[PDB]
Amino acid sequence: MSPILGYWKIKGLVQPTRLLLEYLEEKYEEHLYERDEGDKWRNKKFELGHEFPNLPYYIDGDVKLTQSMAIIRYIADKHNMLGGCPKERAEISMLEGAVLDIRYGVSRIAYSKDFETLKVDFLSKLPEMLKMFEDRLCHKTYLNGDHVTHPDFMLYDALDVVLYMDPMCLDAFPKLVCFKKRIEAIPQIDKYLKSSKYIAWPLQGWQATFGGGD
Amino acid sequence: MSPILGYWKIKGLVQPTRLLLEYLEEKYEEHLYERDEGDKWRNKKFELGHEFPNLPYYIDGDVKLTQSMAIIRYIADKHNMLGGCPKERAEISMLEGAVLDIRYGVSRIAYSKDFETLKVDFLSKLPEMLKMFEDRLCHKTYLNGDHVTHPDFMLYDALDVVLYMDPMCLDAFPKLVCFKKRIEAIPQIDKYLKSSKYIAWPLQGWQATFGGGD
Ligand SMILES: N[C@@H](CCC(=O)N[C@@H](CS)C(=O)NCC(=O)O)C(=O)O
Numbered sequence A, B: 001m002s003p004i005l006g007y008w009k010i011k012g013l014v015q016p017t018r019l020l021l022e023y024l025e026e027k028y029e030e031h032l033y034e035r036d037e038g039d040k041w042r043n044k045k046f047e048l049g050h051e052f053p054n055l056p057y058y059i060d061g062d063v064k065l066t067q068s069m070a071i072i073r074y075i076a077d078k079h080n081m082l083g084g085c086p087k088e089r090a091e092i093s094m095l096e097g098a099v100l101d102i103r104y105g106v107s108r109i110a111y112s113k114d115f116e117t118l119k120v121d122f123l124s125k126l127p128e129m130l131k132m133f134e135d136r137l138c139h140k141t142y143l144n145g146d147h148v149t150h151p152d153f154m155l156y157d158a159l160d161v162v163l164y165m166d167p168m169c170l171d172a173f174p175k176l177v178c179f180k181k182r183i184e185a186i187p188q189i190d191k192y193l194k195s196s197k198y199i200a201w202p203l204q205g206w207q208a209t210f211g212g213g214d
């Protein structure tokens, strides 16, 4: 009747999947769980018809999905965006994982009681990872050349988070600073970011030391 | 000249990729880094021709890969094992991620100074995740029906690790206990496990609290 996507009303793990959607102009509704609704999830968690219950979920009627990365890859696969030959898939997946080292690097520490000191060790390695992305862009509009691919949205999302973490981490990465602006200047994403549908905060689950609250 | 796969001489993140290989009878050589060889990696790390240097790496000459999950998906894609329609990819990827919640659950805590207490909270949630896998198998030889898929090897690997963690965690999961035996009873894997080529330990990087040492 119309694709469903369920998650907490935070950016978290599905923010990118949201942006891919907006970029594709796919129609979808959203089940959004408020912080105060742990019980509500707990019940609809057990009955939606999933074999690996979890959040986020994505229901096409055609399918019932539960893993964050499958859900986004499945959207891209619906639109023939995962790659033609293997060398292509494989490489998209590489960008994928490389962007996940950054986004998970953040997530891994955000809910710990030692965040501020774990912080110092992440921003240290970050540049290193940041750079690979900069060099990758010395010659390609987007992460995989001309045509947008889902990790361009992963990558977007990751810069957005690290910037709240250290506003300057992209001083020294002009190429990355233009990519974040570019993705922004794309009409569909342009609209979504100023739409009512946009969720600007929290970055992580609310309880989180970093990116928590309101 | 012959596919290369490089990693530390531990099971770690590539053990499953190794098992897929052995199951496919693909020929490959291995660059194995001993614990004492951090400097050696550090030099060959910078020159192999990778845009996202890292371990593991997989060099087909046809391609130069670096993310653990892409490398294994790329092997499966070489053999037409990632799925026919999208509903297929998507679902394989689901098994994928669901098995990664378990394997990363372990990895996330193994190198921490509070392991033993973090331990207690993992084995708690484990059953929950374990079960999804058991129910998934009430009616399918393998994780995706009759034909073996790469998460069957991920899943294998994950049971192997958690068993060193708690030898009984599979009492209560007879269906899972037969799957671990089955995968074992497959001639190719049968051979590899008793071959010289097999790496039985360490589970994690050597420095690790859990699964470290020799
Ligand atoms: N690996 C999974 C992780 C899922 C996950 O950790 N979900 C959390 C939110 S960050 C959820 O609260 N779990 C809901 C539940 O377990 O019922 C994915 O990529 O989707």
Ligand SMILES: N[C@@H](CCC(=O)N[C@@H](CS)C(=O)NCC(=O)O)C(=O)O
Pocket: A097, A098, A101, B012, B013, B045, B053, B054, B055, B056, B066, B067, B068, B069, B205
């Ligand atoms: N997300 C990456 C993680 C890679 C990774 O963490 N590799 C560690 C071993 S567990 C390696 O020592 N990094 C080597 C390096 O950074 O040079 C993957 O899936 O391959």
